[PDB]
Design a protein around this ligand. Structure first.
Ligand SMILES: [Cu+2]
Ligand SMILES: [Cu+2]
Ligand SMILES: [Cu+2]
Ligand SMILES: [Cu+2]
Length: 457
């Protein structure tokens, strides 16, 4: 029987007062009638709530580690000073606390992602439950919410999509084999299996966050056999300039796509499938199958008469005049993935001085750099950088679609593809920054497909 979609609780992070976030084990009912032991972040008496922030506020956090092993939280998408970013060098032992130095939220409104980042164990800790959404608000978001009467949990809905495998008793199975990362046989949305959500004939906002270890989704909305239109309005780095109408989106681990859906396109009593088509991005456990993710049930009319806005935000093109190119070649050396022929374990893992570790490349504050990913392997890699968003300039396999527009922080690099992104490495901090660059297939990350880079003060 289909279950109604669970909606996460939320936490309004205090502006400047220190909030405790505890990682701990508990027992949850995920499969109806069975118990599953899972990790959770507990904040403000909620498990894995959506963290709400306002641009400009002070972000003041403590991580309390009861996860059973070294851990640290990373705020995926934040422009943060690197000692507050959740770099693995700062992971604290089990039972200890990490006090994040305060910083100001300077990111654009949109959907962000908090999750653990320990050396070699990130795939395990996300998989077993440590993952949640962040929503940052600013004036463009205020204006959009009023334009459309969007309300969190009512018409503004997180879709945290994840694949897991359960045994008979309900215990999770985490058995990565091969080099495609971990692939699960059960699709969950907000830890809800086989979900449905009742909707009215009006516009909803869905915040799709791929919280899976390795599996990408090619998502469409099926009204019978026909694809329904919908609109991309935001990506990892916030709102696009104006809405982009699509009939599918490709979403890899680490990517976030904000969409609007107008169920006035459907009729009362329609069942609309959020459906996964083959991603076509691929020793391994991967598949390329199609399957339903969840369904929307149109139960009721609404007096709703708002329109999709003509404009959302300003997105300023990066000026790449004179930018230097930094080639980043993805390869493999004896069944391990490499970045410019190296792994994390080739001199990055145990620096003598964590403030001055090995870096693959180094930039000055304000440099505009073009990173050119060259995937010389047979599997895709969703390449993510900490510290900055970026703009995708070009793909060798084709033109840019809606989910690569705007400000991004994770870019799919398909097998044998070359992708150029432009990074404006301007930051407001007064010390040099050590930021990660790595694959967001979490088993690749754990195996060392990760480097530091440096941006001076
Ligand atoms: Cu991440
Ligand atoms: Cu990140
Ligand atoms: Cu990878
Ligand atoms: Cu990371």
């Amino acid at each position: 029987s289909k279950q109604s979609l669970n909606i996460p609780g939320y936490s309004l992070f205090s502006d400047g007062q220190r909030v405790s976030i505890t990682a701990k084990w508990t027992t949850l009912e995920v499969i109806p009638g069975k118990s599953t032991d899972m990790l959770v972040y507990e904040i403000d008496n909620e498990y894995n709530p959506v963290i709400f922030l306002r641009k400009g506020q002070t972000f003041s956090a403590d991580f309390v580690n009861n996860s059973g092993e070294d851990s640290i939280i990373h705020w995926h998408g934040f422009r943060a000073p690197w000692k507050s970013d959740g770099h693995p060098y700062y992971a604290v032992k089990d039972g200890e606390t990490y006090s994040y130095p305060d910083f100001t939220i300077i990111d654009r409104s949109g959907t962000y992602f908090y999750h653990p980042h320990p050396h070699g164990r990130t795939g395990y800790q996300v998989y077993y439950g440590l993952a949640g959404m962040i929503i940052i608000e600013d004036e463009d978001e205020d204006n959009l919410k009023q334009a459309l009467d969007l309300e969190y949990g009512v018409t503004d809905i997180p879709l945290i999509i994840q694949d897991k495998t359960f045994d008979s008793s309900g215990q999770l199975v985490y058995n990565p084999m091969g080099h495609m990362g971990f692939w699960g046989d059960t699709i969950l949305v907000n830890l809800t299996p086989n979900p449905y959500m009742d909707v009215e004939r009006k516009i909803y906002r869905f915040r799709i966050l791929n919280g899976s270890n390795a599996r990408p989704y090619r998502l469409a909305l099926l009204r019978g056999n026909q694809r329904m239109r919908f609109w991309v309005i935001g990506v990892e780095g916030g709102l696009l300039d104006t809405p982009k109408e699509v009939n599918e989106i490709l979403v890899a681990p680490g990517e976030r796509i904000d969409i609007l859906v107008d169920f006035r396109d459907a009729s009362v009593n329609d069942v609309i499938k959020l459906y996964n088509f083959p991603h076509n991005l691929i020793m391994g456990m991967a598949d390329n199958s199609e399957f339903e993710v969840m369904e929307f049930r149109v139960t009721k009319d609404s007096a709703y008469d708002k329109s999709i806005p003509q404009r959302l935000s300003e997105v300023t093109p990066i000026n790449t005049d004179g930018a230097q190119v930094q080639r980043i070649t993805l390869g493999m050396r004896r069944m391990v993935f490499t970045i410019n022929g190296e792994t994390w374990e080739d001199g990055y893992a145990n620096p003598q001085d964590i403030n001055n570790p090995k870096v693959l490349f180094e930039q000055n504050n304000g440099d505009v750099v073009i990173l050119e990913y060259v995937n010389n392997t047979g599997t895709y890699h969703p390449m993510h950088i900490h510290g900055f968003q970026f703009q995708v300039l070009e793909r060798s396999l084709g033109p840019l679609g809606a989910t690569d527009l705007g400000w991004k922080d994770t870019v799919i690099v398909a097998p044998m593809e070359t992708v150029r992104i432009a990074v404006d490495m301007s930051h407001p901090y007064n010390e040099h920054q050590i930021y990660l660059l790595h694959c967001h297939i979490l088993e690749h990350h754990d195996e060392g497909m990760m480097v530091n880079y440096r941006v001076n003060a």
